[PDB]
């Protein structure tokens with residue numbers, strides 16, 4: 236009973252404190268190999284990752300799930316290099332985000348299913364590294380292609396037991412349509428995390444989903460453009476709600492009885508080519524702690540607001556363990 | 563004077579009979595490495611490309627220019643492998659086609675220039691293989707991003723002497739806007755080929771660009787869905803004009819005195835993931851000669867219509883040599 240990481244199978248107990256939604260680098264397929272100098276160099280990007288992951292490890296983190304797909308420019312050799320150097324387990328993702336190229340965009344459910352199965356069952360590219368999660372996306376009402384991806388993801392997950400995690404536009408309650416399609420396909424909600432759910436203050440939306448058995452991805456806690464409201468690009472990406480506001484959703488879902496179903500993350504990165512230039516310097520200003528932000532700031536904050544230690548252990552250790560374990 | 567190929571620099575005279583607009587595999591960045599099974603396997607794609615290239619070489623072809631960009635999933639290692647096994651030179655391209663991912667789409671003119679220069683001056687990825695041509699695209703009126711690509715292409719060309727070749731929607735006369743943007747950047751028209759110009763029967767349009775010194779890319783001669791019109795995807799790709807109708811545009815431009823500005827090609831490929839599934843099968847049934855189509859079918863057609871052998875030699879040998887030669 237194992238979880239696949241970029242360095243091979245680990246037992247469930249080796250996962251430990253897990254960040255369920257992160258990135259080493261948010262990019263585009265082939266981009267890091269073709270234009271490494273965009274990040275200074277490949278090795279500069281690798282060293283910055285290792286630095287961050289090592290700080291994160293010292294704050295308690297033992298595993299990250301990199302939910303970078305093919306079209307987010309996932310580079311599993313990079314993941315494996317920084318994973319070994321930082322001694323942090325990394326889980327790699329299959330699926331598709333919202334920038335699929337034509338060779339993906341034009342594919343059928345059946346073809347998309349073969350591709351996801353391949354990255355899980357056989358390996359990514361020629362590396363033998365197998366994905367341990369499936370990432371999907373909608374950005375409002377699903378496009379016909381995005382529906383095809385949701386159905387292919389559900390099928391790959393039913394075939395392998397590997398779970399599904401999603402990008403939503405939470406302001407458009409995208410989780411509801413994602414849920415309806417997963418349920419028509421036959422996927423159990425306990426195998427699905429509806430992500431970016433911390434982008435909304437609509438508790439009605441989040442409890443309805445948790446009521447139906449979905450894990451709830453509160454995965455962007457440090458994302459805030461408060462204090463640089465005249466950077467339009469950064470305000471659009473990070474929002475104008477505080478990290479405290481986002482984190483209090485964690486407490487709120489615990490008070491409604493759903494601690495079992497929460498997954499907490501930073502949605503951090505060491506490189507971000509698929510947004511405006513120098514966004515990574517803006518982000519690093521806003522949250523200097525990077526991936527360490529959850530353990531160093533958010534856990535202590537929840538403790539101080541009356542959340543018991545056993546509860547936080549369950550969210551940061553047991554919820555990720557149950558979710559990632561294939562079933 | 564030298565041209566960069568996927569096996570290093572060659573002299574002008576080694577290029578010989580050159581197809582200026584071809585593909586080994588039309589795809590998407592990273593796609594061939596992530597999902598080789600789409601093409602059967604990497605081995606099966608290479609086998610088919612080497613066979614098709616040896617077929618082309620036996621008909622007289624010595625060089626092709628693969629105008630597959632980054633976002634067309636150009637794999638220069640595949641290009642090196644098949645170039646060498648078939649003993650046909652391949653010129654690799656930089657630039658961007660019309661499926662740029664976000665990491666390209668959001669870049670400034672300056673950033674794109676630096677990217678194109680990297681692939682010409684240094685190499686593609688970590689291979690040391692340098693691009694010998696810059697490929698760009700509009701599909702209608704230029705988007706803001708495509709405008710930035712054209713300007714970045716002009717600046718890369720000006721700095722390196724490497725020529726620019728374009729994708730157009732010919733039916734919307736894109737080459738007119740492409741020309742204005744390039745000229746606004748001070749690029750000489752003789753460094754520019756306006757491609758897919760055989761997709762239109764608009765001689766007024768084509769002769770006006772030729773008059774301004776542009777090279778005219780008649781690059782899809784075997785492309786035709788006549789006979790299989792009820793295949794809607796193939797019809798939209800290949801069109802409802804015969805290969806002979808396309809080839810007669812070559813004769814038309816020669817007749818108007820523009821033999822020196824014509825570039826003829828097949829726009830062929832050995833895999834095509836960035837269109838509908840099994841399109842390769844439709845295309846191969848239409849044109850089984852693949853890249854040998856120009857020398858075995860089009861050159862004898864134009865001879866029978868009274869075009870002199872010396873003019874066909876100019877168009878297939880001299881025009882490419884002059885266009886590909888880096889010239890500042």
Ligand SMILES: C[As](C)(=O)[O-]
Pocket residue numbers: 261307402502
């Ligand atoms: C790469 As993201 C902003 O969708 O987590």
Ligand SMILES: C[As](C)(=O)[O-]
Pocket residue numbers: 585588634729829
């Ligand atoms: C790859 As094409 C059909 O624009 O030559």
Ligand SMILES: [Zn+2]
Pocket residue numbers: 401402403431
């Ligand atoms: Zn997302």
Ligand SMILES: [Zn+2]
Pocket residue numbers: 256257258302502
């Ligand atoms: Zn993310």
Ligand SMILES: [Zn+2]
Pocket residue numbers: 728729730758
């Ligand atoms: Zn084209």
Ligand SMILES: [Zn+2]
Pocket residue numbers: 583584585629829
């Ligand atoms: Zn082409």
